[PDB]
Write an enzyme that holds these catalytic residues in place. Sequence first.
Site, PDB file in Angstrom:
ATOM      1  N   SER A 115     106.151  -2.735  29.898  1.00  0.00           N
ATOM      2  CA  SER A 115     105.756  -2.006  28.692  1.00  0.00           C
ATOM      3  C   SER A 115     105.353  -0.568  28.854  1.00  0.00           C
ATOM      4  O   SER A 115     105.168   0.111  27.853  1.00  0.00           O
ATOM      5  CB  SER A 115     104.653  -2.699  27.929  1.00  0.00           C
ATOM      6  OG  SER A 115     105.218  -3.867  27.285  1.00  0.00           O
ATOM      7  N   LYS A 162      99.039   3.666  28.885  1.00  0.00           N
ATOM      8  CA  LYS A 162      99.931   2.639  28.314  1.00  0.00           C
ATOM      9  C   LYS A 162     100.133   1.666  29.459  1.00  0.00           C
ATOM     10  O   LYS A 162     100.583   2.056  30.562  1.00  0.00           O
ATOM     11  CB  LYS A 162     101.319   3.182  27.837  1.00  0.00           C
ATOM     12  CG  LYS A 162     102.179   2.016  27.252  1.00  0.00           C
ATOM     13  CD  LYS A 162     101.529   1.437  26.002  1.00  0.00           C
ATOM     14  CE  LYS A 162     102.275   0.124  25.517  1.00  0.00           C
ATOM     15  NZ  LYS A 162     102.033  -0.967  26.475  1.00  0.00           N
ATOM     16  N   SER A 163      99.789   0.394  29.233  1.00  0.00           N
ATOM     17  CA  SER A 163      99.925  -0.588  30.308  1.00  0.00           C
ATOM     18  C   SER A 163     101.269  -1.323  30.254  1.00  0.00           C
ATOM     19  O   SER A 163     102.096  -1.095  29.378  1.00  0.00           O
ATOM     20  CB  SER A 163      98.798  -1.664  30.194  1.00  0.00           C
ATOM     21  OG  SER A 163      98.922  -2.374  28.952  1.00  0.00           O
ATOM     22  N   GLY A 164     101.498  -2.175  31.255  1.00  0.00           N
ATOM     23  CA  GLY A 164     102.691  -2.969  31.234  1.00  0.00           C
ATOM     24  C   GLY A 164     102.403  -4.233  32.050  1.00  0.00           C
ATOM     25  O   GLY A 164     101.549  -4.228  32.942  1.00  0.00           O
TER      26      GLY A 164
HETATM   27  C1  LIG Z   1     104.914  -4.983  27.996  1.00  0.00           C
HETATM   28  O1  LIG Z   1     104.671  -5.072  29.218  1.00  0.00           O
HETATM   29  C2  LIG Z   1     104.877  -6.225  27.089  1.00  0.00           C
HETATM   30  N1  LIG Z   1     105.004  -7.389  28.049  1.00  0.00           N
HETATM   31  C3  LIG Z   1     105.841  -8.520  27.724  1.00  0.00           C
HETATM   32  O2  LIG Z   1     106.481  -8.606  26.658  1.00  0.00           O
HETATM   33  C4  LIG Z   1     105.924  -9.610  28.793  1.00  0.00           C
HETATM   34  C5  LIG Z   1     104.742 -10.521  28.696  1.00  0.00           C
HETATM   35  C6  LIG Z   1     104.311 -11.327  27.538  1.00  0.00           C
HETATM   36  C7  LIG Z   1     103.101 -11.950  27.929  1.00  0.00           C
HETATM   37  C8  LIG Z   1     102.648 -11.725  29.193  1.00  0.00           C
HETATM   38  S1  LIG Z   1     103.723 -10.677  30.000  1.00  0.00           S
HETATM   39  C9  LIG Z   1     103.554  -6.189  26.250  1.00  0.00           C
HETATM   40  N2  LIG Z   1     102.522  -5.508  27.020  1.00  0.00           N
HETATM   41  C10 LIG Z   1     101.468  -6.089  27.691  1.00  0.00           C
HETATM   42  C11 LIG Z   1     100.552  -5.112  28.440  1.00  0.00           C
HETATM   43  O3  LIG Z   1     100.905  -3.945  28.301  1.00  0.00           O
HETATM   44  O4  LIG Z   1      99.562  -5.491  29.108  1.00  0.00           O
HETATM   45  C12 LIG Z   1     101.216  -7.596  27.695  1.00  0.00           C
HETATM   46  C13 LIG Z   1     100.119  -8.179  28.389  1.00  0.00           C
HETATM   47  C14 LIG Z   1     102.164  -8.502  26.971  1.00  0.00           C
HETATM   48  S2  LIG Z   1     103.135  -7.841  25.598  1.00  0.00           S
END
Ligand SMILES: *C(=O)[C@@H](NC(=O)Cc1cccs1)[C@@H]1NC(C(=O)O)=C(C)CS1
Length: 257
Positions: free
Chosen positions: A39, A201-203
Amino acid sequence: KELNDLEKKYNAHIGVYALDTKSGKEVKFNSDKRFAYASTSKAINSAILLEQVPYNKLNKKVHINKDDIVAYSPILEKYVGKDITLKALIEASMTYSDNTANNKIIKEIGGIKKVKQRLKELGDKVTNPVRYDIELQYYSPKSKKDTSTPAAFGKTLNKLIANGKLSKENKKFLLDLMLNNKSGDTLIKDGVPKDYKVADKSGQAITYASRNDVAFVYPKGQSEPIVLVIFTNKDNKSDKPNDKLISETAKSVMKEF
Ligand SMILES: *C(=O)[C@@H](NC(=O)Cc1cccs1)[C@@H]1NC(C(=O)O)=C(C)CS1
């Protein structure tokens, strides 16, 4: 603070690229190794779109139908059969990491092909978007799909947002979302001195405990940000990440500035 040590401590792989934009000083660690960016790519797409649409024009509306909806879209799922502004799409993408919002943003930019075209223009031949959400989150060490290196990703963030072509209003809109994004509190925000401002912005990909945070970090007293990219992952597909690892990495890197 030794990054080799934190990898030992957390039984994890750390990728770091940091650039103090005032001095141009850099900190690098496994900076040319590929990691799923997950993300954190939403920041890049949002900025690319903001290069294209002036702030006063973000009121433009886009129609959302059932085919647009993908998983983890807390905001967009409410819009099926309705219209949404480009402003609200980006807010949903940046604040709630809404996947459907990010996909729509990529479509508005003109598709994955156009994102690639812009990255090549910014001199990034590394960052490799191939899939939309949520499929881009299925990371595999054996594939380069939707991965980048800390250095390539940070250089692009710097060119696009820190030293780039966004208006004062669009840059403020986007950095304000990153500053106020509470979902990133356990990451870089957790490891920097408490008087620092952090726009992040995390991922998190679905696999290999792929956990990341990218940010524009402002030391108290400095208006030029330090661009900080931290990508981490582990050896097993089903490993759970520990956000403290990113917090400790940021604490260590920031001591270099
Ligand atoms: C971005 O990294 C998105 N991640 C996903 O769609 C995969 C996952 C769904 C659940 C766990 S991993 C979104 N961003 C984030 C974040 O930035 O921390 C999370 C936790 C899930 S949606």
